[PDB]
Design an enzyme around this catalytic site. Structure first.
Site, mmCIF file in Angstrom:
data_model
loop_
_atom_site.group_PDB
_atom_site.id
_atom_site.type_symbol
_atom_site.label_atom_id
_atom_site.label_comp_id
_atom_site.label_asym_id
_atom_site.label_seq_id
_atom_site.Cartn_x
_atom_site.Cartn_y
_atom_site.Cartn_z
ATOM 1 C CG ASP A 12 -1.756 -1.285 1.317
ATOM 2 O OD1 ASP A 12 -2.294 -1.826 0.321
ATOM 3 O OD2 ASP A 12 -1.880 -1.874 2.439
ATOM 4 C CD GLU A 183 -7.158 -2.733 -1.523
ATOM 5 O OE1 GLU A 183 -7.509 -3.822 -1.062
ATOM 6 O OE2 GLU A 183 -6.017 -2.247 -1.231
HETATM 7 CA CA CA Z 1 -3.157 4.442 -1.212
#
Ligand code: CA
Ligand code: CA
Length: 291
Positions: A12, A183
């Site tokens: 991430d 996401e």
């Molecule tokens: Ca991000």
């Protein structure tokens, strides 16, 4: 071109230049507290720095009572004389979550001011308050995108003086017929269009890692974001930028850096399926993002 893949694990990611170094931040290691921080001179060979939030913030338990010790999916920008660090407090699988904000005048110094709660979610919401993304509209004013699963990706304007939400919460991407398996938004304004990239995740394997990077564009920041075929990202649209290759599986967690660099993680089939930081130049000359 492809800059390369990191030595060090990162999931991430977000990345920013400060002085003669690059800093890449990511989700904390599961067995540790806080946010993961990497430093390099060449954006390729990285060293692990002291994490951010080695001590948790006391207010987190008021919104996410049994938060996991690692914080997730940092996002950083320098704006109006400060670094702004949005991050996620949550527990695996849950939509009881919160996005927090911290600020600093120096990443290398490692000092961060707690700015408190940005937005939260509970089981009563049809969204998950994780995976923040700070973006700027055509007038240079701040907005925040976020989301993961449930009804998908949300968007709010921010007050430029507090960097917290103002106005209505907008919906900008969803996968209603694939379990909401998306996401990790990233959003930028280039050449008269707003561009939204999201990670499409695996919906149905019980793990829900990232799988592909998908994109769309819109004349307005609030959408609709349309893919190359004309399909709305609210109806599961999104053109695929990257679905991986022989070595690199499940690309995702992508973030647009300086308008023309795409960072992301992908899982190394030659190194125990560990997620690494991969970086490419980004071209927009076609009307759409491209490697
Ligand atoms: Ca991000
Ligand atoms: Ca970002």
């Amino acid at each position: 071109a492809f800059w390369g893949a990191s030595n060090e694990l990162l999931h991430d990611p977000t990345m920013i230049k400060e002085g003669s170094s690059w800093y890449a931040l990511g989700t904390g290691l599961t067995e540790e507290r806080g946010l993961r921080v990497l430093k390099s001179s060449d954006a390729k060979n990285w060293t692990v720095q002291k994490s951010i939030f080695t001590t948790p913030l006391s207010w987190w338990s008021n919104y996410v009572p049994n938060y996991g010790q690692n914080q997730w999916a940092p996002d950083i920008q320098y704006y109006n004389g400060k670094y702004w660090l949005y991050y996620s407090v949550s527990s695996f699988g849950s939509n009881t979550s919160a996005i927090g904000l911290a600020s600093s005048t120096s990443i290398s110094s490692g000092g961060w001011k707690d700015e408190g709660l940005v937005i939260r979610s509970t089981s009563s919401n049809n969204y998950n308050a994780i995976d923040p993304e700070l973006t700027f509209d055509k007038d240079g004013n701040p907005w925040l995108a976020f989301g993961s699963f449930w009804s998908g990706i949300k968007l709010t304007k921010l007050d430029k003086s507090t960097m917290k939400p103002t106005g209505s919460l907008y919906s900008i991407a969803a996968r209603p017929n694939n379990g909401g398996a998306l996401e990790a938004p990233t959003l930028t304004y280039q050449n008269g269009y707003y561009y939204l990239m999201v990670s499409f995740d695996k919906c149905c394997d019980g793990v829900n890692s990232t799988y592909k990077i998908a994109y769309g564009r819109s004349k307005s920041i609030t959408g609709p974001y349309l893919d190359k075929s004309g399909k709305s990202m609210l109806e599961g649209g999104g053109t695929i930028l990257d679905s991986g290759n022989d070595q690199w599986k499940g690309p995702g967690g992508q973030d647009i850096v300086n308008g023309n660099i795409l960072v992301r993680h992908a899982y190394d089939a030659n190194d125990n399926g560990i997620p690494k930081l991969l970086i490419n130049d980004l071209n927009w000359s076609s009307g759409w993002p491209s490697y």
